[PDB]
A paper describes a structure:
Salmonella enterica serovar Typhimurium (S. Typhimurium), a gram-negative bacterium responsible for innumerable cases of acute gastroenteritis worldwide, utilizes two T3SSs, encoded within its pathogenicity islands 1 (SPI-1) and 2 (SPI-2), to invade cells and establish an intracellular replicative niche. The core component of this machine is the envelope-associated needle complex, which consists of a multiring base, an inner rod, and a needle filament extension that protrudes several nanometers from the bacterial surface. Furthermore, four residues at the end of the C-terminal α-helix, three charged (K66, D70, and R80) and one polar uncharged (Q77), form the lumen of the channel and create an electrostatic surface potential of alternating charges, which spiral upwardly about the needle, a feature that has been proposed to be important for substrate translocation.
These mutants are located within the C-terminal α-helix and resulted in specific phenotypes, such as constitutive secretion (PrgIS49A) or deficiency in the secretion of SipB (PrgIV67A). We found that S. Typhimurium strains expressing the PrgI mutants D10A, D11A, V20A, S49A, E53A, N55A, R58A, N63A, and N78A retained the ability to display SipD at the tip of the needle filament. Although limited by the resolution, the differences in helical symmetry in the two mutants analyzed resulted in small but measurable local differences in the distance between the mutated residues and neighboring residues from adjacent PrgI subunits in the assembled filaments. However, the predicted electrostatic potential of the lumens of filaments assembled with the PrgIS49A and PrgIV67A mutants showed significant differences with wild type. Indeed, the two mutants analyzed by this approach showed subtle but distinct changes on the electrostatic properties of the lumen surface even though the mutated residues do not directly participate in configuring the lumen surface.
Numbering used by the authors:
A (entry chain P), B (entry chain J), C (entry chain D), D (entry chain I), E (entry chain A), F (entry chain O), ...: 3 to 80
Write the structure that this text describes.
């Protein structure tokens, strides 16, 4: 078992929160790439890609906030 | 059960809202393709196709608005 | 019961508005086809066919206007 | 009493501005659907439908302008 | 097997919908060209040519609508 | 009773300020999803969605300003 | 009193402009229908019907022009 | 007399600068709402609404600049 | 004296530029409505209506350009 | 009467300097929370909130400077 | 002096171009109406009426062309 | 083997997704250029060109979204 | 010498390109207005007017393209 | 002589660069307002207005760039 | 004569350096507030406001540097 | 030498194509007018007049086609 | 060798696709201009002119599509 | 030899990439200005102008991207 | 062998990580500069340039983080 | 010879590094100010201004870094 700190556990709450969003984006892109003119495949990929943008931005700002909460405690040791 | 977030649920309100509009367009196109000169088949396909344009544009703008409401909250975490 | 949106309901106001105009055209054509020289059958078919031209053009422009009223609202979501 | 904000009140100035334009369109369409060949019913429906296009486009652009006036104030809080 | 996307499949529903309309126009034109004064050959070619006008215009507008449904989804990715 | 600080109370002034805007958006979307072609349902949903964008952006910037007013006082303790 | 907008008032300038042209056409048709061989009744009905064609075409183009003048102002709000 | 600081006085230079622009927009909207098809009422409301967009954006950027001039002086006290 | 900004003054250059074009259209329509078959009244109304279309479109685009010149200056304050 | 030292008196010069700025922010937020789409309520709240940011930052830096002037005198007793 | 724009001046080049063609048609019709069997009065009225058809059609197409030249410049302001 | 990152692999999913769409456009253009009047060659080229527009726009927006997902992570390193 | 920028110089390439097309249209209209029934004067005016439509549309689109080339450079300064 | 800094001198290079473009726009608008149907006055005003859009946008972006070059030097004093 | 130390003299080099920049901002704001849509008044106020931002930031950083040069000499007395 | 564009050169191919058809019609009409009963003068004038009808209709349709070929290129600049 | 980009090469596929269609139109017009009454010269020129209309419209729309495919890639660089 | 940095060298790759596109646009405009009705001169100028739009937009976005790559390195010096 | 510290080795992990991305950008720009209208050359350059933006921003933030990790250790020596 | 320390010599490496970039910006602005609509003058000024932004920001950060390297040595004398 590799080491995983608190910022890893915050990042793994988002990773285990979504079930297979990293898989559903890649599958719906590969279904879209075979036929990039189907409205049932473009509107399904729009919902996957727009969630994957919002999943990944919220996951990359929650880590940055907890990095800044810790950087004002560690700076107050000395 | 695959994962479905909030933008999927907004997209699935439109998908479960219409009963079989993705089926009625394909059926009325296949009825039209056998005889593309019947006014009862052209005027019926006009109503299906024009709804399928308005169904899909409203479904692809409501996702884009909720993607922009979330992108101004996630940007205000830090 | 199949799904029928608003453009279907506008199209079905014209379809249920006329009682059997899709039937009276086909019957008066089949009466005309047996004897295409009777003035009582040509002048009766002229009134059916000219109404069926005006019925179907008004039914295919009212759908196109309501498709354009909706396409300026849906475009103003974002 | 349900909640109605400022964009609802701008939209309700148009809705209470016209008296029964949502009713006069539906009535003049149902009078037209029984007899879609009367020039007194086609020219009366043309005036109702063309106003209902201009009523609804001006009502759907005034909301979009006030949404853009507010989105440049709210963006200037921070 | 060559690649065929969704707009090709919509275009091939019209092409496989009619059986040999691209052949019946060319055959009835070549029968007409040998004797361009037969009313049984002019009235048969009128029905083929007028269907081939309506077949090809409906096939070239259904592609253009589905190109415009997709161009409002693809524009809403970003 | 759960704990609610000052930023929660600023966020709950917006939440208790609107009566049922989180409900009126979901209801007017579910009314729109059954028939996404009615201009009385698209223009009503435009006013709800555009208010819900302006409600939520002003609620997510007022919290961020009060977080920045406090972060310049807390930084001036030491 | 029912609501009447500007396109109704343009249409009612033509309707109140002619006194009883909608009545004189119907009366001169009912006088013609009893005896459709009188030159004093055919030449009088020709003048009524040809005016009623020019009355109704000018009334249905002046509305369409004012609908297009307004549709280039309303489109320039946003 | 309530308190009004410098950013209020900059905001009140715009408010007392225009005489009754907050009134002329509401009056020209209520005149437009009774008859949303008059070109003399649409082109007059276009000039009021487009000024009210430019009035309010310049008033909401001049406050934000003076908030940023002060935030670089106050930050240079310590 | 009511307030009139720069976009009002651009709109009032067109309004004071034409002397009584808003009056000459209404007078030539009321002269046309009494007798909608005179070629001296149809060709005179064609010249008034076609100028009133070009007057009002140029007046509603010059305001929109000056609204866009100002919206790129006001956006460059901050 | 509770005790109030010099840093309290510097803080109370800002508190008694503004009359009711702690009240005008809370009132203009509660007026904004009932209708968060009015430009007269967003631009008025922007001026209150931006002053309340500059009031409170200048009040929390003037105390910190006088704490540092005193901490270099008290350190020079011994 | 009433206002006369460019389309009026194009229309007045035709009106001042012919000297009294609007008078010569009415005079030669009133001379014809007293005796509608004279070949010197029918052949003179044929030349007046056929010129008045060609005068008025060229005058009503030159205005429509200059309305379309201007409508492609005014549309290219924005 | 040249280097290909993740945005290249997203771009190569579209390139390897379509089999020879870059070839079928060039071949159907060169077949069209020899005889630009065949409806079987214009309607076949319409389906290739409209897919090649939708293929290339979706391929040039999916790269731009993944460039923006990465630019909000890389910006949150520091 | 008045100032003339680059869009003036593009517009003056068309103005100095044609020698006296603004004069030949006005002269051939004034020759046509004296006798609007000569086929040598109608067919000569058709060639002048149709060139003056194509001269002025190409001159009003080349300015609009160069305005759009510059508006994507000026927008890329900041 | 009033004070004029460097951003004024950059703004006065554009103001003294064009000779009387602020005058030529107002003169060509006042010539257009007297007769808004002349193609020689619409195409001349299009070239003035499109230059005045490009003059003013380049003048309002060059100031904003030099404001940002200075704001990264002044921020690097301390 | 009131007392003015060295940091006052550095601050008064900026105050006497600009002639009436504190007056030209207030005058160009009061000219802008009467008509907040003139491009000659918005682009003139942009140059005044952007200089007044750069004047005041450089004046509030030069004082802070000389306060830090002195605070490392005074700290080196003891 | 006056200016002559491409539509003039197409019109001058017809004018220089026929040698003196504008002269032979006028001469054969003046020979016919002295004696309008000679079969050698009526049958010669029939051949001149019927050619002058076909000359002038083909000359006035070839200009209109080339005006429409150019109007679909000029419209595709922007 | 002059420079020729991709839109030139698309335009030169049409130019080198037809062998001498720009020559066959000019030759068949000059053969028609000498004798504009031959049915073997009118029906041959109809086939050349109608192909030259379809050649040039397809050549001027394929360039405009590839200009729009590129304008959505170049816009997605930044 | 004048100085040319890296953004000049990126801009000079586009300038030396095209051979004489700045010359071919000006030559094909001056050939078009002498005769703005030739389809061989309009379709040749369309290909030059549409390339010159795509040349200049790609040249003005590649500079802006490399300005933004450098502005995130220079900002990371301190 | 020149000296290369730890921040050089972190920078050389990115430089040796990509194989020839500094070469593939320059080659795909020089292929694009010869023909800046090919969609196969614009979409290939978009993927190279967008990776080169993300390569260089991640390489210029990882150095800045390791410079800040070291600057909090070196500051804790004394 | 005036005195120039090490930070002057670092600043003079940038000043003598570029040959006449302070001159080429002022010359290309004065060439742009005479004609602010030439794409060859806007795209040339974009490359000068964007380099002058990157020249001056790198010159104003390299001085600030060397000021901070020295301020941690001078602080370690005592």
């Amino acid at each position: 078992t590799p080491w995983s700190g608190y910022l890893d556990d915050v990042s793994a709450k988002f990773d285990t929160g979504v079930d297979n969003l990293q898989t559903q984006v890649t599958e719906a892109l590969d279904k879209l790439a075979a036929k990039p003119s189907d409205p049932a495949l473009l509107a399904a990929y729009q919902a996957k890609l727009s969630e994957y943008n919002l999943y990944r931005n919220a996951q990359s700002n929650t880590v940055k906030v907890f990095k800044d909460i810790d950087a004002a405690i560690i700076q107050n040791f000395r």
